[PDB]
RNA sequence: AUAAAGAUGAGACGCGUUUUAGAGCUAGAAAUAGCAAGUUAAAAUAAGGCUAGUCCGUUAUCAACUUGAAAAAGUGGCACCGAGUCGGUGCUU
DNA sequence: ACGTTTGTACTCCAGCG
DNA sequence: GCTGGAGTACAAACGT
DNA sequence: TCTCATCTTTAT
C-alpha cells in the first residue's frame, strides 16, 4: 500500500523503466526463482531496461511481394504465347518449348539435345553466326519479307514480350519522325502560317543540341527561350515547347479561355482536353498541336533510337546493331593498338578477369563506369586513342546491348516492332493473322491500379470484385472484373470511417450535403448588432435562409460588407450594423453548388429536395474515379437527365478531397421525440442557434447516446491492434507496446497497487501514449496521473548537477534516465500542482523546498541528492535483452557459384547445389537443445550427445510439424523429446563467476554481462572527455578542469576496472594485452584525448555482439565466440520483460 | 490554403546473379606457350504451400509453467541495514 | 604413437537503380 | 553499417 | 528507378 511512481524513457531500440517512492528511493524486493537450480530467491531492484531490435517498415515486404507478382505475371505471359504457338510448334519442331524450359540444366539432367533452339550443333552455330545478337534477328524479321522459321519468330516475339518496356507514355508513338530540327522548322513554319503579326524567327538555332540536351527539361526550355529573340516561355511558342518536352503548360491566360485547359502529352486525357480546346477556339490550331506532338516524339525518341529511320521499320534493333558494330570496330582497334604500343598489358586488359579491363567487363563483374575508369588512364598513355577518348567521354565506347539505359525505352517501340513482325509473317502462317490482336494484347495488357490482386477471397490485400466466375485472362479482364466497383473499393478501403459512428464511411469533401452543413454551421454563429437593438442577436431561421438563398446562392464568396449592405440595409433596412464571432472572410463556402451550376446551366434542378441523392452520386463519381471512360460509365446511368455537352463538362470536372464527418451523422440520427436530424436542428434551432459540437455533447438530446452506442460497438480494439492504427514509424510503435507491457508487469509486481504518477519521455505520438496509458490505468477522472516530459528537461538536470551520462559504459543509463524522469516529474507535480495542464530553480533558498502549503517532500536539498546518488550508484539493474525468434528471409540473396560445399542451399528441389550453385549463410530462427545418440566413427556406436541444433527459418515449419522426425532426419537417434528446449536468440546462460553469455546462433555467443563502473569514474570520464562540451559556469568548469587535471590516477584505475572485468567475464586475452600495451604507449597525450579514447575502450566491455574499437591509432579486431560448447553445461535463465521474475534451468543436469 | 516528410497499398520497367547454349586454332606426350574470340538468349529469382487464384510466401506479435481449440486467463509476502551485478537480519504467510 | 577434431586468429562478404 | 556465416591456416587436444 | 491512391504530422 506504499505510494509509488513509474518513470519511463522510450526509444526506438530501448525502453527504460524505474520505480520511485515519495522519498525518491528505488525499492529493493526479494523475488522467487523457479526451475531446478539451487538458487531460490534473488533480491532485485525495481529499476531496469528492456532492449530489443528495431521494428521494420513493411516497405521491403511490399517490394518483395510486388517483385514476386511481376515474375509470376511475366511467366504467365510467356505461357500464353506458348499456348498460342503450340499447335503449329508441334508441327515444325515439337518439344522446342521443352528444350527452352530445360535450358537451365546440365547435360546429365536434360532430356533432349543440349542445343535449345535447333537441336543440333551445325544450325545452332550457323544461327549464332547469322544473328550475333537477338537484335539482328529482330531487325531481320521486321525488315525481311521471305518466310522464316517459326522458332525465330517465336524467339523475337518472346523477347519482345518478356522485356516489353515501360508504360509511362500513353497514346501512340510514331517512330518515323526522329529529326528534332526538321520538326522544329515545321513548328516554326506552322506558327508563322497561322500567326502573321509576330512571326517567330528560329533560323540558325542548334535545335538538336538544345532540345535533346542532358540537363533538366525546365532548364532545357529556359535555354531554348533564352536563344529565342523576343519570345516568352509563357507565350504561345514557349507553351508549345513546354508541352513538347512534357512540362504541363497553362493555355488559359494565352487564349483568354477562362478555363485552365492544361495539356500533357503523356496522359491519355489529352485527346479529350484537346477536343475541349478545339471546341473553345476552333480547329485552325489543330495542325499546331499535331506538329507539337510530332516535335515531342522527336525529342523523346532521338535520345534513345539515335539512328536513321527512313531505311528500316525497327529503329531500336537498328540502334542495337549499330552499337554492336561500334563495339566490334573499337575492340579491334583497341586490341591492335595495345598489341602495338603497350604489349605487356595485354594479358591484364584482355585475359585477366579479376582486373577491370575488357575481360573484367565481359567475363568479370565490372560495370561500364568501372571499365571506363580503368581504361581511360591506359588510353591517355598511348597514341592514336583520340577517337576512343571521344567516345569514352560521350559514354559510347564498347557498349553492351543489355545496359541500364534501357529503362527509358517505351513499350511503343517493342509494340511497333512486334506489329511489323506479325504483318511480315501473317501471309505464310495464318495463325498469327488470326491471333494478331491476341499477342498485341499480351504485350499491352497491364493490370491497372484500382484493381486488386486478381484473387478469389484468400488474400489480405485484395479488393477487386467479379462480375462473373471465369478465370481472368488478358482478354476477358474487362468482362470478369467490375472495374468501376473495384475502383470504388480501391478508394474506399483506404479512406476513413468517421470517428462518431465507426462502421460508416465518410462523404467526399466537395459533397453538397457537407457543404450545406459547413455553411449553416458557420452561419449559426454569426453575431450582428444594429442601431436600436440593445443586445446583439442570433439570426433566426428565415434570416439565415435568406442569406443563404441570396448572398451565398449568388456569390461564391460572401463578405461582411455584402451582408451589411445587400441584406441588412437593402432588405432589413438597417445601416448601422456591426458583427462579431466571424472574420471578414467566411471559412465555409458552397463551391460545389456554384461549380455544378456553371456546368449544367439550371437552377431549378438543385434546389429541389428529392433529387439530392443522385447529385450526391455524381459528386461521388467525380471524387472516386480518374479514368475518363470509368467516369462516363457511371454518368451514363443518368444519361437521360442532361445534355451531351453538359456531361462532357461533368466528365471534365474532378474533386479531390475527403471530409471527416459522415452523412448519417448529418441527415441521419434524429431525436427520439422530435424526429428531426441534426441538419434540421441546425436549419432552425430557435433562439439558441447552437452549433454541431454541442449537439453531439447535449445531454437532453439522444445524439449523445447514439454516438456512444456506436463507439462502444466493436469494443474498440485489442492492445496491439490499437497500437497498429497509430501514426509514426513501426519501431516507435514497438517501443510503445513494450512500454505498456512493462507498466503492466510493474503494477503486477507491487501487489496490484497503482501509482499516482506515471512519467513518460521520448509530440502528438507522445500525447497518444499518454492517452493509452491513461485509459489503461484509470478504469473517468485521472486517479493515476500521466506526465510527459522532454529531453531538454532532464538534459539540464544532468548537465547542471554533474549527473553526466556516458552511454558507452553500460546499458544502465536507460534505467537511470527513467528514474530521473520519475524524480523530476514527481517533484514538479508536488512543487507546482497549478501547472499540471502542460504536464499531466527549486532544485538562496530553503534546504527543504516547499510550495507553501503541502511541500513536504518537494525537494529537500540534502538527503534527496544523496539518495539519488546512491540510486545511480546501484550495481544491480535488471537489463533484459528481449529474446526473439528471428524471422525474415532465409539465407543471403546472392546466388554464389558452384562449389563442393555442404553450406550451399538449393534454389529449387532438383537443383543440387554442387552442380547448380545456390544460396549461402542461412539465418537460424531459434536453436533447440537435442539430447540424443549419434552414430560416431566407422564402428557406428550410439554415443550419447548434447548439442545445439539451430533450426533455420526455412525449416521452422518442418521442425514444428514434428520435431522427432526432423531431428532423426538430421541424424540424432533415440531423441528425448522432454529435454527439447526452444532456445531463441538472446537466450541468457550464466556459466561461472557471474559470466553470462547470450545466444546469437547455434554457433556463436554474445557477451551478456554489464560493467557497473563506479560513478566517480563515470563523472570523471564525462568531464575529461569533454562530453557535451562544458555546461558549467566559468568558475565551476574551471574547477571541473582542475578536477580533470588533478585526478589523473582515475585513468589507470578505470583501466584496471576494464582489465579486471574482462579477465572475469570477457575472456579475451590478446585484445586485453593489446589494450594495456596501447595504454602504456599513449600515456603522455593530454587527458582529454586519453579519456575520449578510454571512452572508446568500453566496446570490449559492452553487452551485445563484440565489435572492433580503436584506441588512438591502434585498432583491435573483435573477439568472437565462434563455437557454443560452454553454455551447454550452464544455467539457462528465462527472464520476464522487466526481468524481476526469473526461471533458472541448470542445463548440466539434462 | 501551401509545402515537406513519413506510413500503407497497388500497378510497372531496368540491371545484377546463377546453370546451360553460342563446336576455339596451332606447337607438344603433357605441363604449358603463342594466337583467335568476347557484346546474346533460355530458365530461375526466396525452398515452396493449398484454398489451385494472373493467389499466397522476408511487417507486426513471441520468458517459463499450468488451464488450454485458440484467443486469453492463472501462477511468485513485507520491512530495515548496507552495495561489484545483489547480500544479510527479523516477522507474517 | 599418431591421425582426426575442436580452438584460435584472420580475412572477406553481405541485391540495387 | 552491423554482425553473423564461411573459408583458410595452424596448433592443441582428444581418441583410437 | 516509374505510376497511382489513402492517411497522418509538422511548418508556413
Curated annotation (Swiss-Prot):
Which top EC class is named for this enzyme in its record?
Answer: hydrolase
Instruction: Enumerate the Pfam families for this protein.
Output: Cas9-BH, Cas9_PI, Cas9_REC, Cas9_RuvC, HNH_4
Required cofactors, per record? Mg(2+)
Q: Region (PAM-interacting domain (PI)): which ranges?
A: 884-1150
Query: Which keywords appear in this protein's UniProt record, sorted alphabetically?
Result: Antiviral defense, DNA-binding, Endonuclease, Exonuclease, Hydrolase, Magnesium, Manganese, Metal-binding, Nuclease, RNA-binding
Q: What is the effect of changing residue 1120 to A?
A: Dramatically reduced target DNA binding, slightly decreased target cleavage
Domain of life of the source = Bacteria
Q: What is the effect of changing residue 761 to A?
A: Only cleaves 1 DNA strand, probably the noncomplementary strand. Processes guide RNAs correctly. In vivo, loss of Cas9-mediated CRISPR interference in plasmid transformation
Could you tell me which residues belong to the region RuvC-II?
717-762
**Location of the region described as Recognition lobe in the Swiss-Prot/TrEMBL record:** 55-717
Q: Summarize what activates or inhibits it.
A: Only has nuclease activity when bound to both gRNAs (crRNA plus tracrRNA), which results in conformational changes in the protein and formation of a central channel which binds target DNA. Also requires interaction with PAM to trigger catalytic activity. Nuclease activity is inhibited by EDTA.
Cite the GO molecular-function annotations of the record: 3'-5' exonuclease activity; DNA binding; DNA endonuclease activity; metal ion binding; RNA binding
What sections of the sequence does the record tag as coiled-coil? none
Q: Positions of the region RuvC-I?
A: 1-61
Q: Does the keyword Manganese apply?
A: yes
User: Which annotated residues bind Mn(2+) 1?
Assistant: 9, 761
Q: What is its EC number?
A: 3.1.-.-
UniProt xrefs under Gene3D superfamilies = 1.10.30.50, Ribonuclease H-like superfamily/Ribonuclease H
Q: Quaternary form? A: Monomer. Binds crRNA and tracrRNA.
| Protein name, entry field | CRISPR-associated endonuclease Cas9/Csn1
What gene does the UniProt entry assign to this protein? cas9
Amino acid at each position: 500500500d506504499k505510494k509509488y511512481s513509474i518513470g519511463l524513457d522510450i526509444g526506438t531500440n530501448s525502453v527504460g523503466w524505474a520505480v520511485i517512492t515519495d522519498e525518491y528511493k528505488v525499492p529493493s524486493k526479494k523475488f522467487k526463482v523457479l526451475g531446478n537450480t539451487d538458487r531460490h530467491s534473488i533480491k532485485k531492484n525495481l529499476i531496469g531496461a528492456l532492449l530489443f531490435d528495431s521494428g521494420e517498415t513493411a516497405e521491403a515486404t511490399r517490394l518483395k511481394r510486388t517483385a514476386r507478382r511481376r515474375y509470376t505475371r511475366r511467366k504467365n505471359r510467356i505461357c500464353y504465347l506458348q499456348e498460342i504457338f503450340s499447335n503449329e510448334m508441334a508441327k515444325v519442331d515439337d518439344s522446342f518449348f521443352h528444350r527452352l524450359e530445360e535450358s537451365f540444366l546440365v547435360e546429365e539432367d536434360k532430356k533432349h539435345e543440349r542445343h535449345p533452339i535447333f537441336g543440333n550443333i551445325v544450325d545452332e552455330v550457323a544461327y549464332h553466326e547469322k544473328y550475333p545478337t537477338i537484335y539482328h534477328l529482330r531487325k531481320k524479321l521486321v525488315d525481311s519479307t521471305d518466310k522464316a522459321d517459326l522458332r525465330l519468330i517465336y524467339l523475337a516475339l518472346a523477347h519482345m514480350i518478356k522485356f516489353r518496356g515501360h508504360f509511362l507514355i500513353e497514346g501512340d508513338l510514331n517512330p518515323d519522325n526522329s529529326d528534332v530540327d526538321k520538326l522544329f522548322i515545321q513548328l516554326v513554319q506552322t506558327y508563322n502560317q497561322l500567326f502573321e503579326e509576330n512571326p517567330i524567327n528560329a533560323s540558325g538555332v542548334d535545335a538538336k543540341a538544345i532540345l535533346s540536351a542532358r540537363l533538366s527539361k525546365s532548364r532545357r526550355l529556359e535555354n531554348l527561350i533564352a536563344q529565342l529573340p523576343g519570345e516568352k516561355k509563357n507565350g504561345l511558342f514557349g507553351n508549345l515547347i513546354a508541352l513538347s518536352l512534357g512540362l504541363t503548360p497553362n493555355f488559359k491566360s494565352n487564349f483568354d479561355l477562362a478555363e485552365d485547359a492544361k495539356l500533357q502529352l503523356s496522359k491519355d486525357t489529352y485527346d479529350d482536353d484537346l477536343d475541349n480546346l478545339l471546341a473553345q477556339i476552333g480547329d485552325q490550331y489543330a495542325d499546331l498541336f499535331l506538329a507539337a506532338k510530332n516535335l515531342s516524339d522527336a525529342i523523346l525518341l532521338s535520345d534513345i533510337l539515335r539512328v536513321n529511320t527512313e531505311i528500316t521499320k525497327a529503329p531500336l534493333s537498328a540502334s542495337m546493331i549499330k552499337r554492336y558494330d561500334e563495339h566490334h570496330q573499337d575492340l579491334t582497334l583497341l586490341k591492335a593498338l595495345v598489341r602495338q604500343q603497350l604489349p605487356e598489358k595485354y594479358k591484364e586488359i584482355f585475359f585477366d578477369q579479376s582486373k577491370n579491363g575488357y575481360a573484367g567487363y565481359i567475363d568479370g563483374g565490372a560495370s561500364q563506369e568501372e571499365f571506363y575508369k580503368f581504361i581511360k588512364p591506359i588510353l591517355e598513355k598511348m597514341d592514336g586513342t583520340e577517337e576512343l577518348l571521344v567516345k569514352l567521354n560521350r559514354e559510347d565506347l564498347l557498349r553492351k546491348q543489355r545496359t541500364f539505359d534501357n529503362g527509358s525505352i517505351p513499350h511503343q517501340i517493342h509494340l511497333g516492332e512486334l506489329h511489323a513482325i506479325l504483318r511480315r509473317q501473317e501471309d505464310f502462317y495464318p495463325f498469327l493473322k488470326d491471333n494478331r490482336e491476341k499477342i498485341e494484347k499480351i504485350l499491352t495488357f497491364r493490370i491497372p491500379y484500382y484493381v486488386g490482386p486478381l484473387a478469389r477471397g484468400n488474400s489480405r490485400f485484395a479488393w477487386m470484385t467479379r462480375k462473373s466466375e471465369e478465370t481472368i485472362t488478358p482478354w476477358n479482364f474487362e468482362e470478369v472484373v467490375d472495374k468501376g466497383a473495384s475502383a470504388q473499393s480501391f478508394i474506399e478501403r483506404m479512406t476513413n470511417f468517421d470517428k462518431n459512428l465507426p462502421n460508416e464511411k465518410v462523404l467526399p469533401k466537395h459533397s453538397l450535403l457537407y457543404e450545406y452543413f459547413t455553411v449553416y454551421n458557420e452561419l449559426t454563429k454569426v453575431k450582428y448588432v444594429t442601431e436600436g437593438m440593445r443586445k446583439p442577436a442570433f439570426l433566426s431561421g428565415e434570416q439565415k435562409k435568406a442569406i443563404v438563398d441570396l448572398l451565398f446562392k449568388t456569390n461564391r464568396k460572401v463578405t461582411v460588407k455584402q451582408l451589411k449592405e445587400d441584406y441588412f440595409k437593402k432588405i432589413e433596412c438597417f445601416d448601422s450594423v456591426e458583427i462579431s464571432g466571424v472574420e471578414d472572410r467566411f471559412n465555409a463556402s458552397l463551391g460545389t453548388y456554384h461549380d455544378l451550376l456553371k456546368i449544367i446551366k439550371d437552377k431549378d434542378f438543385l434546389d429541389n429536395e428529392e433529387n439530392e441523392d443522385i447529385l450526391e452520386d455524381i459528386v461521388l463519381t467525380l471524387t472516386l474515379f480518374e479514368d475518363r471512360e470509368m467516369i462516363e460509365e457511371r454518368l451514363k446511368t443518368y444519361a437521360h437527365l442532361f445534355d451531351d455537352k453538359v456531361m462532357k463538362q461533368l466528365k471534365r470536372r474532378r474533386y479531390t478531397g475527403w471530409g471527416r464527418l459522415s452523412r448519417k451523422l448529418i441527415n441521419g440520427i434524429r431525436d427520439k421525440q422530435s424526429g428531426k436530424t441534426i441538419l434540421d436542428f441546425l436549419k432552425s434551432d430557435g433562439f439558441a442557434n447552437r452549433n454541431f459540437m454541442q449537439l453531439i455533447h447535449d445531454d437532453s438530446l439522444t445524439f449523445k447516446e447514439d454516438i456512444q452506442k456506436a463507439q462502444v460497438s466493436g469494443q474498440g480494439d485489442s492492445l496491439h491492434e490499437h497500437i497498429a492504427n497509430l501514426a509514426g514509424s513501426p519501431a516507435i510503435k514497438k517501443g510503445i507496446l513494450q512500454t505498456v507491457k512493462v507498466v503492466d508487469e510493474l503494477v503486477k509486481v507491487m501487489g496490484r497497487h497503482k501509482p499516482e504518477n506515471i512519467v513518460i519521455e521520448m509530440r502528438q505520438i507522445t500525447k497518444h501514449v499518454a492517452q493509452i496509458l491513461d485509459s489503461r490505468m484509470n478504469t473517468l477522472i485521472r486517479e493515476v496521473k500521466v506526465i510527459t516530459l522532454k529531453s531538454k528537461l532532464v538534459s539540464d538536470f544532468r548537465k547542471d548537477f554533474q549527473f553526466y551520462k556516458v552511454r558507452e559504459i553500460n546499458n544502465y543509463h536507460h534505467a537511470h534516465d527513467a528514474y530521473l524522469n520519475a524524480v523530476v516529474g514527481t517533484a514538479l507535480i508536488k512543487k507546482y500542482p497549478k501547472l499540471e495542464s502542460e504536464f499531466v530553480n527549486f532544485f538562496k533558498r530553503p534546504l527543504i523546498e516547499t510550495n507553501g502549503e503541502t511541500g513536504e517532500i518537494v525537494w529537500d536539498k540534502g538527503r534527496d541528492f544523496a539518495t539519488v546518488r546512491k540510486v545511480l550508484s546501484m550495481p544491480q539493474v535488471n537489463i533484459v535483452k528481449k529474446t526473439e525468434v528471428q524471422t525474415g528471409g532465409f539465407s543471403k540473396e546472392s546466388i554464389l557459384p558452384k562449389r563442393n560445399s555442404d553450406k550451399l542451399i538449393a534454389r529449387k528441389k532438383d537443383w543440387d547445389p554442387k552442380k547448380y550453385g545456390g544460396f549461402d549463410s542461412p539465418t537460424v530462427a531459434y536453436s533447440v537443445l537435442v539430447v540424443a545418440k549419434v552414430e560416431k566413427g566407422k564402428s557406428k556406436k550410439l554415443k550419447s550427445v548434447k548439442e545445439l541444433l539451430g533450426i533455420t527459418i526455412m525449416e521452422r515449419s518442418s521442425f514444428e510439424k514434428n520435431p522427432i522426425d526432423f531431428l532423426e532426419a538430421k541424424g540424432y537417434k533415440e531423441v528425448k523429446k522432454d529435454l527439447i528446449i526452444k532456445l531463441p536468440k538472446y537466450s541468457l546462460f550464466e556459466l561461472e563467476n557471474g559470466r553470462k553469455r547470450m545466444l546469437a546462433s547455434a554457433g556463436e555467443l554474445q557477451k551478456g554481462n554489464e560493467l557497473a563502473l563506479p560513478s566517480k569514474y563515470v563523472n570523471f570520464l564525462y568531464l575529461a572527455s569533454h562530453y557535451e562540451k562544458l555546461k558549467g559556469s566559468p568558475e565551476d568548469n574551471e574547477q571541473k578542469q582542475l578536477f580533470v587535471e588533478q585526478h589523473k590516477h582515475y585513468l589507470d584505475e578505470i583501466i584496471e576496472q576494464i582489465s579486471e572485468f574482462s579477465k572475469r567475464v570477457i575472456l579475451a586475452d590478446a585484445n586485453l594485452d593489446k589494450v594495456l600495451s596501447a595504454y602504456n604507449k599513449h600515456r603522455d597525450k593530454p587527458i582529454r584525448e586519453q579519456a575520449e579514447n578510454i571512452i572508446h575502450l568500453f566496446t570490449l566491455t559492452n553487452l551485445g555482439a563484440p565489435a572492433a574499437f580503436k584506441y588512438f591509432d591502434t585498432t583491435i579486431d573483435r573477439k568472437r565466440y565462434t563455437s557454443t560448447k560452454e553454455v551447454l553445461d550452464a544455467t539457462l535463465i528465462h527472464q520476464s520483460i522487466t526481468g524481476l521474475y526469473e526461471t533458472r534451468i541448470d542445463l548440466s543436469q539434462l
